[PDB]
Amino acid sequence: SKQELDAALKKAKELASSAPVVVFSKTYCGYCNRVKQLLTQVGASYKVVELDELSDGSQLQSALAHWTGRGTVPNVFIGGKQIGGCDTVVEKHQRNELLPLLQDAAATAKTSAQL
Amino acid sequence: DAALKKAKELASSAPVVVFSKTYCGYCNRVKQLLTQVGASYKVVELDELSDGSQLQSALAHWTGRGTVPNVFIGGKQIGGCDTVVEKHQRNELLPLLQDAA
Amino acid sequence: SKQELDAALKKAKELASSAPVVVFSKTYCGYCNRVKQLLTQVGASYKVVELDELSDGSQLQSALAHWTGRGTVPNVFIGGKQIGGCDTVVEKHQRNELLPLLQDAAA
Amino acid sequence: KQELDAALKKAKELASSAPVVVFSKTYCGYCNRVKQLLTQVGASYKVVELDELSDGSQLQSALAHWTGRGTVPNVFIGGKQIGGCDTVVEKHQRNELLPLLQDAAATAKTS
Ligand SMILES: N[C@@H](CCC(=O)N[C@@H](CS)C(=O)NCC(=O)O)C(=O)O
Ligand SMILES: N[C@@H](CCC(=O)N[C@@H](CS)C(=O)NCC(=O)O)C(=O)O
Ligand SMILES: N[C@@H](CCC(=O)N[C@@H](CS)C(=O)NCC(=O)O)C(=O)O
Ligand SMILES: N[C@@H](CCC(=O)N[C@@H](CS)C(=O)NCC(=O)O)C(=O)O
Ligand code: FES
């Protein structure tokens, strides 16, 4: 469990930074679909990690719980930074804060320093 | 951190501690099971607390479980509804409870 | 097996009218919980049917889809009349239309 | 009662308006998956994005009354009901999908 708890945490962290936007999700969840709706509405591209379609989904989820303090889906990352869940994303949209998050993350990622 | 301290204190404040939400069917199931078998337990309903989401987040950080119920016996992490139900079917729950009492 | 579907429709109709407020639900669903929480906070009493806990749950949902136009959960009935899902109840309540319905399923 | 009868009629018309019709929502992962699969196997398909239509909700509700399916995608081949993303994917795994598409391709319009 030890070298394998480190493994799952390692894998979750990689996934979380693996795309400009990353949504940890379950295929059956409407809260997850609402986040997807809000991202699509703002014209963002994003990666979805459906945890229930992964054999290590369970372990990835508890790694996310330990790391982020959010053990529920959706668990949203923008530019590798923890955003929050569905309530969070709805709030960012409602206050017009979702677009700047996306654009600021993209600006940071564009043509980064080699050193 | 404040929430992490409160959560740990809470989890140890009785022989059995169930972190819960009033609307949760899985919490109801554990609660029903625990009282069937005659156990006394403390319940902390997170949805009735101002700091409830911080407390839940502390529990995720500490236990790796981000959902309710989150069940403790003798200050030790047991798990959720499924964990408790399935232990009890395979006779592992009454020992633990008796030991903690 | 249109008769597993007639049986499910029958069982569904009986369920829906078995209490003044009925919530077809799944135990794990946050949208279902949002409705349960709201009904409790307004002081209503409800019965819940957790479809994920029944062996004929999927058949009841098709029945509900065929019958009501809604195959998703939550599916909320007041006084035996289909009201809608989480969004509907929350919007109705925000327009003070939820309370009158709840009162009549008592009065 | 007049409104319910019309939306059912429109649903049924759209369902048969192309050799393959996918009732969809733009953000839905199952819809994305079903569209990628149909593309993969060379299907000619028309997508109806319910969230892009003001009567999307009534259309979805018509689809549920009629098909008993309350979710997107809702897929039709040759005017006939197939089901959702899981159903189409299972057809494909059974190699039943290409033959259904070839059947529907016998004539340009659905008979
Ligand atoms: N407040 C959270 C609620 C998220 C939530 O309740 N997620 C549920 C599903 S609807 C969940 O993850 N349950 C455990 C699981 O499905 O793994 C948010 O806004 O994202
Ligand atoms: N498999 C879990 C299911 C628990 C679960 O899904 N709980 C829901 C409440 S119904 C939850 O905590 N959802 C996220 C939330 O309410 O914050 C267990 O056996 O305990
Ligand atoms: N707009 C609906 C959302 C309902 C929804 O998306 N429900 C999901 C679960 S969180 C569902 O029933 N999915 C299909 C299924 O479980 O069979 C509402 O407001 O109630
Ligand atoms: N098992 C179904 C699942 C489809 C599904 O869950 N769709 C979600 C959208 S991603 C849905 O329709 N939710 C209710 C709604 O959008 O009204 C299939 O394979 O097609
Ligand atoms: S499941 Fe229904 S909301 Fe997550």
Q: Identify the burial level of A56 via C-beta atoms within 10 angstroms of its C-beta, where 0-12 means exposed, 13-18 middle and 19 or more buried.
A: middle
Integer Cα distance of C59 and C50 in angstroms? 13
- Residues of A marked as binding for [2Fe-2S] cluster? 29
Q: Resolution for this model in angstroms, one decimal place?
A: 2.1
Q: Do the Cβ atoms of D27 and A48 come within 8 Å?
A: no
Question: Which atom from ligand 5 is nearest to the alpha carbon of A28?
Answer: 1
Q: What is the CATH class of B1-101? A: alpha beta
- Would you say B6 is a known binding-site residue? no
Query: Hey, what are C57's tokens?
Result: 């749950």
Calculate the dihedral angle through the C-alpha atoms of B34, B37, B38, B40, rounding to the nearest 10 degrees.
Answer: -20
User: What proportions of chain B, in percent to the nearest 5, are helix, strand and coil?
Assistant: 55, 15, 30
One-character DSSP codes across C45-67: --EEEEGGGSTTHHHHHHHHHHH
A25 within 8 A of A48, measured Cβ to Cβ: yes
* Residues of chain A with C-beta less than 8 angstroms from the C-beta of B65: 62, 65, 71
What residues does each domain of chain C span? 1-107
A51 within 8 A of A73, measured Cβ to Cβ: yes
Integer Cα distance of D111 and D16 in angstroms? 9
Does C72 contact ligand 5 (Cβ within 6 A)? no
Does C31 contact ligand 3 (Cβ within 6 A)? yes
Query: Hey, what are B56's tokens?
Result: 């839940």
CATH dotted code for A1-115? 3.40.30.10
Q: Solving technique for this entry?
A: X-ray
Integer Cα distance of C7 and B9 in angstroms? 52
Cβ–Cβ pairs < 8 A, chains A and B: 29
**Residue in this structure with the two tokens 């020992």, named with its chain if needed:** B95
A74 within 8 A of A24, measured Cβ to Cβ: yes
**In chain C, which residues are followed by a C-to-N distance beyond 2.5 Å, i.e. a gap?**
none
Integer Cα distance of D110 and D16 in angstroms? 7
Interface test mutation site (partner A, options B24, B26, B61, B77, max chain A beta carbons within 10 A): B61
Distance from CA of A112 to the nearest CA of B (A): 32
CATH code matching the domain that covers D1-111, chosen among 3.40.30.10, 1.10.150.120, 3.60.20.10, 3.50.50.60: 3.40.30.10
Integer Cα distance of A11 and B57 in angstroms? 21
Residues 6+ apart with CB under 8 A from A32: A23, A25, A26, A73, A74, A86
Does A37 contact ligand 3 (Cβ within 6 A)? no
- Pick the residue whose CA is nearest to atom 13 on ligand 4: D71
Helix residue ranges, H only, chain C: 2-16, 30-42, 57-68, 86-94, 98-104
* Residues of chain A with C-beta less than 8 angstroms from the C-beta of B63: 65
Chain A CA closest to residue C74: A30
CATH level 2 (architecture), domain C1-107 = 3-Layer(aba) Sandwich (3.40)
Distance from CA of D105 to the nearest CA of A (A): 32
Residues 6+ apart with CB under 8 A from B9: none
Query: Hey, what are D70's tokens?
Result: 């309350």
Query: Hey, what are D100's tokens?
Result: 């259904």
Reported as type and span, the H/E element at residue A32 is: helix A30-41
Distance from CA of B12 to the nearest CA of C (A): 27
- Are D and B neighbours with ≥3 CB pairs closer than 8 A? no
